[PDB]
């Protein structure tokens, strides 16, 4: 049984700084990619997807290409007040018709101090 753990309930950064959203998985099973979202539900915003998508503001804390990697923390650079919100670390599994969400973290609230 894999768990998605976000050790930070909330985070405060200044505008222009970097936001580090921490997330660790407890298992490699099941196989599947990790995705980051801002918000939950149907209209949630895709923040990161390790297999497809354009996310030039996001860098991974660790090397996700390593087979035994379980750190899925990301860094969002040049934070502005518009980046404030709740970010969820989500584990996906292989399914039909596309990848299917397996488990989501409890979320990390990002708040920003403006300039």
């Amino acid at each position, epitope marked *: 049984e894999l768990q998605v753990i976000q050790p930070d309930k909330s985070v405060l950064v200044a505008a222009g700084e970097t936001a580090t959203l921490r997330c660790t998985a407890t298992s490699l099973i099941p*196989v599947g990619p990790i995705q980051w979202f801002r918000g939950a539900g*149907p*209209g*949630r*915003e*895709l923040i990161y997807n*390790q*297999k*497809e*998508g*354009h996310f*030039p503001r996001v860098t991974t804390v660790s090397d*996700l*290409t390593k087979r035994n990697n379980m750190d899925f923390s990301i860094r969002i650079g040049n934070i502005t007040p518009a980046d404030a919100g709740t970010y969820y670390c989500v584990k996906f599994r*292989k399914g039909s*018709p*596309d990848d299917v969400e397996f488990k989501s973290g409890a979320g990390t609230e990002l708040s920003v101090r403006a300039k």
Partner: antibody
Amino acid sequence: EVQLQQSGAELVKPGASVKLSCTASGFNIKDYYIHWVQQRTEQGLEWIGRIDPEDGETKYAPKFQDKATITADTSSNTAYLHLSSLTSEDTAVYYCARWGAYWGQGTLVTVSA
Amino acid sequence: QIVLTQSPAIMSASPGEKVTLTCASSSVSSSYLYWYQQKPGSSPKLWIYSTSNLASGVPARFSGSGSGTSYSLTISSMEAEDAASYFCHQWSSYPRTFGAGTKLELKR
């Protein structure tokens, strides 16, 4: 730098088959989904499918299901697109893509007797 | 699959003219909406991602907007190098689809 190099133009007789190639550099295809797109002069861009080269899982648009077969080889860092029973409606430019901003230069496939 | 209707399919704008390209969806789409610029003889280039964010190298005169079932691409001041075909793209619903595209010419 990321780059996708596709195979040369192909001429296929109607009813026959062809396998297109796509070799990547600057990254390992094992780490990303590799997509295939076709573009016809009168039907625009159409997503054919993708493959996860890490486990070989393939997805397809229902239009190209029995028509397209996508394979990948992590050793040679190359993805392949096999097309069967090619009709004149399959004459198009076929693109290789790591989804987002990384595309191949395209491969012309003319289906004519 | 989602129908992305780009109308008009061909339009013209003079240098310095503000131009807006529209993309209407048969069903709702989310931040999976990309815009691709394509010129003859070249691959599609990612231009706008996640509705309003410019890809690297895209001039600041470009901007994107929209939500739900209607989106837009806008050039504040038309330039000659902006003459191309622009396709809107969604990949929030399976399978991912493209619009038929709007060809944009410069009115010299």
